[PDB]
Amino acid sequence: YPIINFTTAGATVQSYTNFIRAVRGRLTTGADVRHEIPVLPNRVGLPINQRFILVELSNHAELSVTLALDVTNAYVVGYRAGNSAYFFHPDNQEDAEAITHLFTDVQNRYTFAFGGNYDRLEQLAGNLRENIELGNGPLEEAISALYYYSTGGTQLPTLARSFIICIQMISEAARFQYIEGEMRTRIRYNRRSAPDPSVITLENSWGRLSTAIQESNQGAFASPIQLQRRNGSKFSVYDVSILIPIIALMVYRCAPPP
Numbered sequence: 001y002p003i004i005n006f007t008t009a010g011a012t013v014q015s016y017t018n019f020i021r022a023v024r025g026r027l028t029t030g031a032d033v034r035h036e037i038p039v040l041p042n043r044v045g046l047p048i049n050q051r052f053i054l055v056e057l058s059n060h061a062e063l064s065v066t067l068a069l070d071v072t073n074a075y076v077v078g079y080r081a082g083n084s085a086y087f088f089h090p091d092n093q094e095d096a097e098a099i100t101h102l103f104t105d106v107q108n109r110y111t112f113a114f115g116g117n118y119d120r121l122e123q124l125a126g127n128l129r130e131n132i133e134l135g136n137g138p139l140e141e142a143i144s145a146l147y148y149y150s151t152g153g154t155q156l157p158t159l160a161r162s163f164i165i166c167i168q169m170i171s172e173a174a175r176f177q178y179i180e181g182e183m184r185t186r187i188r189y190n191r192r193s194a195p196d197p198s199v200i201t202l203e204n205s206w207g208r209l210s211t212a213i214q215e216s217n218q219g220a221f222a223s224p225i226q227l228q229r230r231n232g233s234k235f236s237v238y239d240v241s242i243l244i245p246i247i248a249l250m251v252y253r254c255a256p257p258p
Contacts, residue, residue, distance in 0.1 A: 001052045001068075001102075002026045008140035009060040013184045023174045024248060026053045027071050034256055035219055035240040039210075042252040043072040048101055052077070055170055059143040067166060068102045070095075073251050074171045076116060076163065077102070084108040084150040088116030108150070116163065118203075124160035129168070129200055134183065135192030138165045168195065172203050178246045179203070197228040202246070210250035213240045 004026060006019040024038070032039035041050070053071055058064040066080045068087075077099060078087035085103040089112055090096035103109070114120050122128050132138075142162035145154045154162075173180040179199055186192065195203075202209075205225060212221045216239075224236040237243060 001054050003054040003056055003066070005056045005058070007058040007060075008136050008143065009058065011136050011187055013188045016184060016187050017180070020170075020173050020180050023053070023055065023069075023170065027069070027074060027174060027249060032252070032256075034250070035213060035216075036244050037213065037240070037247055037250055039214075039250045039252050040073065041071050046072065048098060051098055052102060057139075057143050057166070059140040061140070061144055063144055063147040065143055065146045066103075067170065068099075069171065070098075074174055074249065076167050076171060079146060080106055081147045081150060084110065086149070087111045089114055091115065116167075118164070118167075121160045121164050121167075124156055125164060126157050127161060129164060129203070130194055130197075132161055132164050133192040133194050134165060134168055135186040136190065137192045139169050142166050168199075168203070172199075175206055175249050176202050176246060177248045180248070196230045197232045198230045201226075201228040206247075207251060209237070209243065209247060211253045212237075213243065213247075213250060214253045214256070216240055 004019065004022045006016070028038040028040060030038070051071060053069050055067045055069060056064060057067065067076050068078050068080075069075065070077050078085060080103045083106060085106040085108070087099050087102075087110070090099065114124065118129060125132065142165040145158050145162040146166070148154045149159050168179070169183055173183050179202060182195070182199055205227060208225055212225055215222070219240040221238055224238045226234055226236055228234055
């Protein structure tokens with residue numbers, strides 16, 4: 001599978017931007033774009049040899065871990081660190097079979113008894129996304145935590161928090177230019193901070209926004225979607241137009257209308 005590399009060592013806004021652009025390029029094919037927004041490959045009929053992409057992360061501590069992402073939804077399905085690989089609990093038989101095609105050369109394969117969804121990860125981490133700092137520092141530390149898990153150097157709560165960090169800085173950033181922007185700001189000023197309401201609400205609404213845009217009538221939503229500003233105030237989205245500068249990738253829901 002295609003591999004994209006990124007290192008927190010000496011990371012800059014430009015290196016991070018190039019990385020995210022590369023991830024998006026491997027996630028989508030360019031065959032599906034609606035209202036100027038690219039759509040991820042339809043899972044139905046997708047050959048297994050095109051199902052995943054690998055993101056190899058390295059840090060200043062000279063440690064590396066490789067995340068495996070599902071191209072149909074940008075979900076992080078597992079990772080490899082040295083001679084060991086860990087996968088989140090598959091949601092169905094199709095997915096369980098699919099992951100057997102990842103990291104086939106690793107000596108030790110493990111499948112977590114829990115899923116990789118935020119609700120579960122936050123529960124294990126003992127903290128909600130709104131209380132977990134993001135930035136280059138948190139990412140560098142998350143890479144180390146993931147790397148030392150197999151040897152008992154990392155506790156479950158810390159492992160869960162580390163996944164939460166990686167998922168947002170890689171997958172959510174790939175999904176939303178807005179979130180990518182927020183991560184760029186953190187890198188530019190070397191600051192770590194938890195995601196504000198605008199970030200959390202976008203992450204939580206990705207599925208709904210994808211469906212709303214795809215089922216829209218010429219771009220107009222049948223029912224408005226509520227999002228939050230940075231200060232937590234609510235505002236409604238009635239059209240795809242206002243989201244073009246915000247969302248970079250959508251999960252496939254249905255075929256586009258004629």
